[PDB]
Amino acid sequence: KDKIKENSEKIKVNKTLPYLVSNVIELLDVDPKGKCAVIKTSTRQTYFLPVIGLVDAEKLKPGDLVGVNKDSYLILETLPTEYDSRVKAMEVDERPTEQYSDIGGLDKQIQELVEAIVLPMNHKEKFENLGIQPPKGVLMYGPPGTGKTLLARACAAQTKATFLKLAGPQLVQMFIGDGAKLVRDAFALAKEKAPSIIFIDELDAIGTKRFDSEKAGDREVQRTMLELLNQLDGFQPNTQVKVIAATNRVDILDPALLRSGRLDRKIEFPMPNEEARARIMQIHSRKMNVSPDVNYEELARCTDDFNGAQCKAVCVEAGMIALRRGATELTHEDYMEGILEVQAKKKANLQYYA
C-alpha cells in the first residue's frame, strides 16, 4: 500500500494540467513487440512513439483526439470528440412550451404528424408486432401565413427527445466545403443523443433544381445538398433520428429530396376555412379582457382570406385600439376597426357606387 501510494504520487506530479492536443493518425506493431501509433499535433508535426502511455490501445482508434505532453510528446488523456462551434450553436436548450391546445384548425395534419414521429418514439412494440418500419422524413408545405413554425416549436415543446434545429442559409459557408463538414457533424451529434429530431426550415434555399449553372452559387450549394442527401438516406441508414422540414414553394426542389425515403410524408397546409379562422381569433382572444357579447362566427365570416398570423394580428390591434379610448373590455366594432387596419385601406372618393 505504501508503494502504490508513492507511485500514484509520482503520477500526479508528472501528469500536469497543460496538454497539447493532437490526432491519432494510425497504430502499428513492431517486432524484435506490442502495439504502437503515430500522431499529428496541432502544430502540424508528426511524431512516432513506441510507448503509448496512459491510455488503452484497444480504446484508441485511427483519428482520435487526445491530450499529449508538450515536451515528452506522450499520450496522457483521451478527449471527447467535439464539433464545429457553429454546430454547438444549433443545439436547443430552452425547451419552449407550445402545447397542442394552443394551435387550431389543423387536427388531421396534427394526427399525421404525431403518427409519423411521436408514436415511433414511444411505442416501438406497436411498430414491431405488425413489424414493418417507421417512416422517414416529414415535410410541411403551403402558404407562408398558414403556420409552419407552430408545429415545430410545439412538438419540440411536448416531446423530450433531443430536438435539434437548423436554418436554411446557415449551411452556406464562405469557404467551399464547410457544408459537408457542418451537416455531417450535426448528424453525428444527433447520433450521440439517439433520441434525436432535427428540423430544417426554408429548405428551398439549399434544395434547388440543378441545371447548366455557371461560375458561382450552385457550385457549392449542390455539393452541400448532396452531402445532405447521402448523409440522410442510403449508405448506412439509421433509425435514431427523425427529420422534419418545412418550406413555402415546392417547385424548386429536386426529386432526390422528395424521393420517398429522404422525405416520407408530405403535409400541405390549407388556410382556415371558416371555423379555423373564428376559433384562432378565439384563441388569441384568450388573454384579452373581452366584453362577453362577441360572435366569433360573425368575426370569421367577415374575416375573409386571412391566415393564422393575420387573424392573430387583428386580435392584437383591437386591444390597442380600445386602449386609444382607454376602454377595458372590447367590442365587435373594435374587431371591425382592427380588420380595417389589417386590410390596408387606400383612399376615399369611392362613392360613385351603389
Binding site: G145, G168, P169, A205, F211, K312, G319, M320, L323
Partner: protein, 192 residues
C-alpha cells in the same frame, strides 16, 4: 410599450414590433427616423440597405448574425432598415440565374427575424419608396405589422411646413404663409 410597459400588461396584449413606412419621397420618414432616434433611449442601429450585398457567399448573412447578436445583447435596442428593395423584392425564377445570394440573405433575415425561439425585446422600423415589389414573406404580419405612409400635404401641411422651414430663419415681423401655400398646390416639405 417601451416607456409604458404597464397598460399592455393591465390589458394583456403584445405590441406590433414590426413597422414599415412608405409614401412619396421627400416627405418626413427620415425625419421621423431621426426624431424617434432622438428620444430612442435605446441601442438604435442604422442599417443601409445596400451594405449587405457583397462579393462572397454567405458573408452578408454573417453580418446578419452579428446584427441579431448585438441586438440580443443590447437589451431594448432598435433596428432601422432603409430601401430594403435590394434584399428580397421578388423570387425571380423564370430563368433562375438572376439574383439568388441576397435572396438567401433575405431568408436569413426571415429566420433570425421570426421563427424558432423569437427574439424577445427588439423593434424593427423599415421604410421604402416602392413597397410594391417585395416578397410577401416580409409582408406577413408579425414581421411587418403596420404600414404607415406619408402623403402630400393638401394645402395646410405645406402651411405648417412653411412654419417649420420658415421659422428657423431671419425675417421681418410681417409674416403670412397661407397666401404662400395657396400658391403651391403641389409641393413637399423639402421644396418648402
Amino acid at each position: 410599450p417601451l416607456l409604458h410597459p404597464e397598460r399592455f400588461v393591465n390589458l394583456g396584449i403584445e405590441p406590433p414590433k414590426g413597422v414599415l413606412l412608405f409614401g412619396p419621397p421627400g416627405t418626413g420618414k427620415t425625419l421621423c427616423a431621426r426624431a424617434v432616434a432622438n428620444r430612442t433611449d435605446a441601442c438604435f442601429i442604422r442599417v443601409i440597405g445596400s451594405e449587405l450585398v457583397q462579393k462572397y457567399v454567405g458573408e452578408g448573412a454573417r453580418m446578419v448574425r452579428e446584427l441579431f447578436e448585438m441586438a440580443r445583447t443590447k437589451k431594448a435596442c432598435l433596428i432601422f432598415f432603409d430601401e430594403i428593395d435590394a434584399i428580397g423584392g421578388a423570387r425571380f425564377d423564370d430563368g433562375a440565374g438572376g439574383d439568388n445570394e441576397v435572396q438567401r440573405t433575405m431568408l436569413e433575415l426571415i429566420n433570425q427575424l421570426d421563427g424558432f425561439d423569437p427574439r424577445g425585446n427588439i423593434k424593427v422600423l423599415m421604410a421604402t419608396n416602392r413597397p410594391d415589389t417585395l416578397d410577401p414573406a416580409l409582408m406577413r404580419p408579425g414581421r411587418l405589422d403596420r404600414k404607415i405612409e406619408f402623403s402630400l400635404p393638401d394645402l395646410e401641411g405645406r402651411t405648417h411646413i412653411f412654419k417649420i422651414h420658415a421659422r428657423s430663419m431671419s425675417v421681418e415681423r410681417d409674416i403670412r404663409f397661407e397666401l404662400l401655400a395657396r400658391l403651391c398646390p403641389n409641393s413637399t416639405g423639402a421644396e418648402i
